[PDB]
RNA sequence: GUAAUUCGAGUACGCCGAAAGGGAAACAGGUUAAUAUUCCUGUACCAUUUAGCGUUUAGUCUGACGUCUCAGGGCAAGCCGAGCGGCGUCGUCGCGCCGUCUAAGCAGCGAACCCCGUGGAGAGCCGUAAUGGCGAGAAGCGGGCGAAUCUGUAAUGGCACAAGUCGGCUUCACCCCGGGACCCGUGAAAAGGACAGCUAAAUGUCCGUACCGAGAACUGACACAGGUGCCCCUAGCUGAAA
RNA sequence: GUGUAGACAGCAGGUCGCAGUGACCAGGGGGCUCUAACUGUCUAAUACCAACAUAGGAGAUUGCAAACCCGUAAGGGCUAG
RNA sequence: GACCCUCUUAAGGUAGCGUAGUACCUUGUCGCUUAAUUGGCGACUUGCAUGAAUGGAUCAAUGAGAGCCCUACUGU
């Protein structure tokens, strides 16, 4: 699994950031959204109940960044293309 | 009548020894809760308390009353403070100490139930729950004494915020002066041996010295109870 | 990145504002306290080193606005963390 | 309560307590021997009551705040060049000085901050005087909100009914706006105001107002070398500078 | 030369005086001791000090219906602790 | 003049400091400073009558504090 998260970005279409993640969930182009342990649920329960799956990361938004090549923090990480991956199966 | 002492002046109630009460934020006490009741409130602000030099939390309760609470360490804006006999034993909650497990740290402890909170209120202090009994519960005071309290006495769970306040040395008369401007205490203080004999039992003499032992009896009347009052012993421990 | 830390300058630290006053012991105490209080402090809500002292015992996170009551010169004390770890161990065990 | 009171702490209810805190609203010119934002001229504004025309958003905001430090914008004062009108100087020269004005009100624009919509920025980019900011959404691009002041109008008033027209520089010690740092110190309250008001008419009582405010109008017995007050203000040159 | 600017900094040459911060304004300096650490306070009107204060150090009382203190009492200060 | 005893009617001055702002004798002895110094500083110290928060010793910085010396300056 130490490469599966990394493989999802090495050979996969993803958009990091809550704004673009929410947009992808709204338009449906995202296969799912990957949310950190610190993300609220006032706008997130609606995206959960929808067909867009919501995955929970095992760590805060600060550390979800460095496991995906980003020096910054990521809270919402709706993927677009698994690519050379089957991360959707791991989500659900 | 060799003049009255500073303690007698303070008891008189003159302005030099009165607290600047208008400068203070609140009379900190637990919210009034009827028998077998509870109330919930949310923390809206953490404010500086001039009367204690420690933060206080402003709490809006469900009943429409806004109250200042003695802030425990870690209490944050947006926290939901619960007060009641059934309240979760969590930091910041006001629960009876009979429901607190042994070894938990409490503060703002009532002397009697519904008293508002008397003990463990200065910055950083805390009490530990030691034993539980059917009619009494024991806590270790910040002074080290064991206090047997009614288990229905309420206390907020945690320690008082502002720990380490006196770790920084004053370093300077002016800094302590600025602290003393918000208190009732007279600053600065003249040593009794520096006074004349009309002003203190220790005053007078061709050279500075008390002339009499500084340990005074517990029976000594006002104007005489000065120095080491009813001292069990004196000196640094051998 | 920091000041010109000269061959002799790394003793007074922030207590250099006092000059030759107040003795070495209390100047060292105040300098150590300043160094500990000015350090980055991680926010327990967002987990980034953005917690700064807003007042005597009041701490706020510059990012998420999380304000709380802590130590006078340190956002988190050891006794409070001991209380938290006791409650966390109890919660985990059950 | 007290032997008792005109005495006494506390409580409850009231009420007072600031001519340097808060605060509804007016300016310029003229007039007297002495008053003048008070009288007169001109042009405004505020409050209540009444009458008509319409009505809650309701409980929030404002009033409302410390010390230090700094950026930006403005501006009274100040300075420079040209024209114009006086005065001075004039042994030679052509310089020096003065003036060349203009209120409130009304209307218009709006810097910073803040907010909203797009945008998607990291083997890093964007900023600041400085601290900084950023996928928990940077830069860039649009919008909203929003200053001092400036522009016009008031423009006919005062000026030798003499000129009266222009530019530029700077700007404290004043106004607006924003940032930062410090506190074992945290820096008032309440009235009032804003958020739904427009038109008309009437009303706006009471007290103060002269003059000195000090090396002679106060106080120290004095026309007192003290004190109150250096309390708040102040032009050119030199000079860091009062 | 720096700077948008106000200005500021610097250079080369010539030159007068006894003297160029020319007036005005404007530290004399150093060494060895005593003493108090320091800023501060004080005998208004003979004592501005080594005295007082101070931060620092230590001790004492008291768990609050407390310790300490005011009042004849009612009731208070410390204590919105 | 150390060390056994005393006199011990509680104990008998530890570290330090020392002719001291404390030293009577006293202008103590010696050294530097001067032509010459009841002075200042240093050392010694038999401390009339020093000594540890009755705080001891010491001390950078500070001082309209108290002494002494050098230089400069001068109608002192
Ligand atoms: K007294
Ligand atoms: K004292
Ligand atoms: K007048
Ligand atoms: K000491
Ligand atoms: Mg006596
Ligand atoms: Mg009144
Ligand atoms: Mg002194
Ligand atoms: Mg003293
Ligand atoms: Mg001599
Ligand atoms: Mg001793
Ligand atoms: Zn945070």
TrEMBL record, chain C:
Cofactor(s) the record lists: Zn(2+)
**GO MF terms on file?**
large ribosomal subunit rRNA binding; structural constituent of ribosome; zinc ion binding
The subunit field of the Swiss-Prot or TrEMBL record says: Part of the 50S ribosomal subunit.
Q: Which family is it part of? A: Belongs to the eukaryotic ribosomal protein eL43 family. Putative zinc-binding subfamily.
Cite the binding residues for Zn(2+).
43, 46, 61, 64
* Signal peptide limits: none
Record protein name field = Large ribosomal subunit protein eL43
One Pfam match, given by its short name, reads Ribosomal_L37ae
